[PDB]
Design a binder for this molecule. Structure first.
Ligand SMILES: O=C(O)[C@@H]1O[C@@H](O)[C@H](OS(=O)(=O)O)[C@@H](O)[C@@H]1O[C@H]1O[C@H](COS(=O)(=O)O)[C@@H](O[C@@H]2O[C@@H](C(=O)O)[C@@H](O[C@H]3O[C@H](COS(=O)(=O)O)[C@@H](O[C@@H]4O[C@@H](C(=O)O)[C@@H](O[C@H]5O[C@H](COS(=O)(=O)O)[C@@H](O)[C@H](O)[C@H]5NS(=O)(=O)O)[C@H](O)[C@H]4OS(=O)(=O)O)[C@H](O)[C@H]3NS(=O)(=O)O)[C@H](O)[C@H]2OS(=O)(=O)O)[C@H](O)[C@H]1NS(=O)(=O)O
Ligand SMILES: O=C(O)[C@@H]1O[C@@H](O[C@H]2[C@H](O)[C@@H](NS(=O)(=O)O)[C@@H](O[C@H]3[C@H](O)[C@@H](OS(=O)(=O)O)[C@H](O[C@H]4[C@H](O)[C@@H](NS(=O)(=O)O)[C@@H](O[C@H]5[C@H](O)[C@@H](OS(=O)(=O)O)[C@H](O[C@H]6[C@H](O)[C@@H](NS(=O)(=O)O)[C@@H](O)O[C@@H]6COS(=O)(=O)O)O[C@H]5C(=O)O)O[C@@H]4COS(=O)(=O)O)O[C@H]3C(=O)O)O[C@@H]2COS(=O)(=O)O)[C@H](OS(=O)(=O)O)[C@@H](O)[C@@H]1O
Ligand SMILES: [Ca+2]
Ligand SMILES: [Ca+2]
Ligand SMILES: [Ca+2]
Ligand SMILES: [Ca+2]
Ligand SMILES: [Cl-]
Ligand SMILES: [Zn+2]
Ligand SMILES: [Zn+2]
Lengths: 151, 152
């Protein structure tokens, strides 16, 4: 398998296009009718940074959960002793671009647990193989991955 | 004001007596309908060990939450720079006595964040003052605290 380059995204189109993760449907807040669509991921093979100390990083859509949980497996197979790490999932702080899929539970920013930046190119590649609908090597510090809305 | 002795419990009766924390109603498992009765505690003035990496230690009943949150405050007042720490809350590992209130989200095992065992006698005392319905200096390593069911 081939790792992504810094700033490469796959598919090589904009995130909110139909070929990728598709339309942004609306921010989901904690008191919203739509908050019920998010379920917390408690997978022990995933590290959630949760620096917010709210659990918000664990919240994501069913489809995001499926792809993340598949990725958790391939990460452990790629690097014995290493785990998938999420630094941002659903966000209620407002610290992404206006209209970010994080506000809707459809995106994660990820690293490896050991925080070896040299692994992140390959991490992104595994995220693509796990079926994330858009994967972007957004930063030296993390990969951004998103999914399509629930059908 | 006065710390508990090693192996002292308060009130000085069995945990599952009325007068302490009262009857064990069934184990709550993660897929159970009764799991919705547990809510995760995200109090920033409490440290959750969460060695399971599941979040299970954060899960507890409303009453447990109220008492634990009161205790978090008195712990910081007692020892400047120190916090309440939980090592076990709700448990799905099966690591307690058969019929443990941990299986129902009604118990916590606690330490101080600095892990100074000499503080634990007083920690237990503060837990009593915070309103836990049974407090037991169960081990050199931790205090066990439980609460009554939401029905009473
Ligand atoms: O600077 C340049 O060279 C260039 O400057 C210009 O030419 C250009 O841009 S600019 O316009 O000039 O600015 C550009 O070409 C370039 O800048 C760009 O690249 C540089 C260099 O990066 S690289 O060489 O390309 O790889 C970037 O600078 C580097 O990254 C930044 C950054 O923030 O992204 C800085 O990194 C430091 O800060 C982050 C943020 O953390 S924090 O400050 O909020 O705390 C650190 O990550 C966080 O901390 C880590 C950590 O310490 O390991 C995690 O904490 C974990 O560990 C502790 C316990 O550890 S320990 O054992 O006690 O030691 C534990 O308690 C935590 O709980 C644990 N987390 S866990 O439990 O959840 O697992 C945190 O999770 C991290 O939080 S996070 O930030 O939200 O992800 C990072 O480690 C830290 N590095 S440092 O070495 O400690 O200083 C630095 O400035 C630099 O880092 S580097 O590694 O030395 O290279 C620059 O940002 C970039 N521009 S930009 O990206 O576009 O903005
Ligand atoms: O008669 C009977 O039937 C019974 O017999 C006796 O009971 C037995 C126990 O059953 C048995 N345990 S066992 O599982 O059956 O094997 C054992 O008790 C031991 C156990 O090891 C353990 O109990 S338990 O967890 O199974 O319930 C517990 O261990 C303590 C340590 O002793 C304590 N050390 S300390 O220095 O005095 O504070 C402390 O560990 C710390 C340490 O700092 C460090 O660990 S270590 O390597 O030194 O071992 C480590 O630090 C980490 C830290 O873990 C981590 N954070 S986190 O919170 O852990 O997540 C982070 O901060 O990093 C640091 C540093 O790491 S690093 O950076 O260098 O990489 O871990 C911490 C820590 O875990 O807290 O605490 C542990 C557990 O406490 S905890 O806080 O709630 O987690 O207790 C000991 C013990 O003291 O006994 O043996 C007893 C019998 O005793 S005996 O061995 O003397 O024979 C007992 O009878 S009796 O006769 O003894 O009275 C009764 O149970 C029954 O009678
Ligand atoms: Ca976060
Ligand atoms: Ca956030
Ligand atoms: Ca625990
Ligand atoms: Ca447990
Ligand atoms: Cl949980
Ligand atoms: Zn992102
Ligand atoms: Zn206990």
């Amino acid at each position: 398998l081939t790792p992504l380059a810094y700033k490469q995204f796959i598919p090589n189109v904009a995130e909110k296009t139909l070929g990728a993760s598709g339309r942004y449907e609306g921010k989901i807040t904690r008191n919203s009718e739509r908050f019920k669509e998010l379920t917390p991921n408690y997978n022990p093979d995933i590290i959630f940074k949760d620096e917010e100390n709210t659990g918000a990083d664990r919240l994501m859509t069913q489809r995001c959960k499926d792809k993340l949980n598949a990725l958790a497996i391939s990460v452990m197979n790629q690097w014995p002793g290493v785990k998938l790490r999420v630094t941002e999932g659903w966000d209620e702080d407002g610290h992404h671009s206006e209209e970010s899929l994080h506000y809707e539970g459809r995106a994660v920013d990820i690293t490896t647990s050991d925080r070896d930046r040299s692994k992140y190119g390959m991490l992104a590649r595994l995220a693509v193989e796990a079926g994330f609908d858009w994967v972007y090597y957004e930063s030296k510090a993390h990969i951004h991955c998103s999914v399509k809305a629930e059908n």
